[PDB]
Design a protein around this ligand. Structure first.
Ligand SMILES: O=c1ccn([C@@H]2O[C@H](COP(=O)(O)OP(=O)(O)O)[C@@H](O)[C@H]2O)c(=O)[nH]1
Ligand SMILES: O=c1ccn([C@@H]2O[C@H](COP(=O)(O)OP(=O)(O)O)[C@@H](O)[C@H]2O)c(=O)[nH]1
Ligand SMILES: [Mn+2]
Ligand SMILES: [Mn+2]
Lengths: 241, 245
């Protein structure tokens, strides 16, 4: 009966990739009824990702689509959306929640417990976004979302980061043609390009104690210095990192 | 199943809670693990106190402040790791005869679950490859056909006593208790020699135990977290300072 959380994670090949997927998987391993939809930004599925997913024992679906200034991960998230629509019928009976989780963010276990009951669309505060310690939806005493507490373009339809919301799968299946915009995308308007088609502000479900707590962090990982590898390479290229 | 005492120095800064959260999420999977968190602060912070309590992990919350003066050549977390070493020696009798292993795990590295099982059986000192250190994709101990470490595959000072990162070795607890005077060198330390300063007083190259498929696999990564941009907070602040992040 517990709704399935479909975690959509775009990823790509770069030094820290395996490390990111490892600590993310270590977090996800704690979450019951979780389906990890990993979409690689590559011409084909890589063995590094295939083996890592296989070895976790997690329930996953491994897809891939290569990106030919559109937001990072867009075509990959869109592929996941189309995959969901091709896999689950509009008015199916298998309850689900969809969450777009980038591979470098930090997620608390409480975050998933909060989003699991999503009826339409849920929202919550996200740390380290918009040049602030955290952005958060503005909720009134009645528990309704009435605005957004941000500095960067506070009046966007939905001034919230990708990691700050989840959508009941039913809405995704019903609005079969709703995808993230990649063409005319404005600064920080991609989230709105999708949400605007799915739900209205007043129907949002505020989580994290009426959006007063931070349960997810927009952490970024520093690029490793590989200067000592030289032009010829020092370490064994066949050793996976 | 020997207890793994994970020594983790930590300090207050924006990404701290997130770092401890994703590290805790990994550690929660490891059985018989004792998390020795040592805060670089004058007193135990409520943030860390609450987080540790809520994880459900077996832990000991300690603290020692690295003199402000010292932060203005002393490696980060040095006094904190030494505090843990002293705590272990004051808690476990020299001849404790109690199975245990000590591992110094910084709060920003990435750790695989397999890593802990590799180090759990350590009899003296075990070593393994570590990604993203020494300006390389990874540094790895070099082993001979006899199964002994005979050197180190590194570009930076590969001929030092122990050319290895803090995340690349673990020490048998009994050895720590036996060599009661062995601590990390506080200051003066030539860059990249801190690990050797301790290890040289604990073991010889020949007594090292190579792990991670005879040092051919990467099970731990020296990842670093970017500093969050808080420019929009302004001088007087924008967000509520009471909200814990
Ligand atoms: O060429 C690229 C760059 C990023 N990504 C992924 O898309 C998301 C975008 O995040 P990243 O650039 O961290 O985003 P930022 O934190 O810069 O907003 C992450 O899951 C990445 O792994 C991708 O698929 N292809
Ligand atoms: O004033 C400080 C700076 C760092 N640390 C901790 O000591 C270790 C040192 O790591 P950090 O500088 O990342 O080390 P680096 O990756 O630079 O080697 C980490 O566990 C930190 O949380 C600390 O206790 N106090
Ligand atoms: Mn990111
Ligand atoms: Mn570090």
């Amino acid at each position: 009966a517990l709704p399935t959380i479909h975690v959509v994670t775009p990823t790509y090949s770069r030094p820290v990739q395996k490390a990111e997927l490892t600590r993310m998987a270590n977090t996800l391993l704690h979450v019951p009824n979780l389906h990890w939809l990993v979409v690689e930004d590559a011409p084909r599925r890589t063995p590094l990702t295939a083996r890592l997913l296989r070895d976790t024992g997690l329930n996953y679906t491994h897809l891939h689509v290569e990106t030919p200034r559109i937001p990072r991960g867009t075509m990959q998230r869109n592929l996941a959306l189309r995959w969901l629509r091709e896999t689950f019928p509009r008015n199916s009976s298998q309850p689900g929640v969809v969450y777009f989780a980038d591979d470098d963010n930090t997620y608390s276990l409480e975050l998933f417990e909060e989003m699991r009951s999503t009826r339409r669309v849920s929202v919550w505060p996200v740390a380290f976004v918009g040049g602030l310690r955290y952005e958060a939806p503005r909720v009134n005493g009645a528990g309704k979302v009435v605005r957004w507490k941000t500095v960067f373009d506070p009046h966007r339809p939905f001034a919230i980061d990708m990691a700050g919301f989840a959508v009941n799968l039913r809405l995704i299946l019903q609005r079969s043609q709703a995808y993230f915009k990649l063409r005319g995308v404005k600064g920080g308007y991609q989230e709105s390009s999708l949400l605007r088609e799915l739900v209205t502000l007043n129907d949002l479900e505020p989580k994290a104690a009426n959006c007063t707590k931070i349960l997810v962090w927009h952490t970024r990982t520093e690029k490793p210095v590989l200067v000592n590898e030289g032009k010829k390479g020092f370490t064994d290229p066949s050793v996976e990192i």
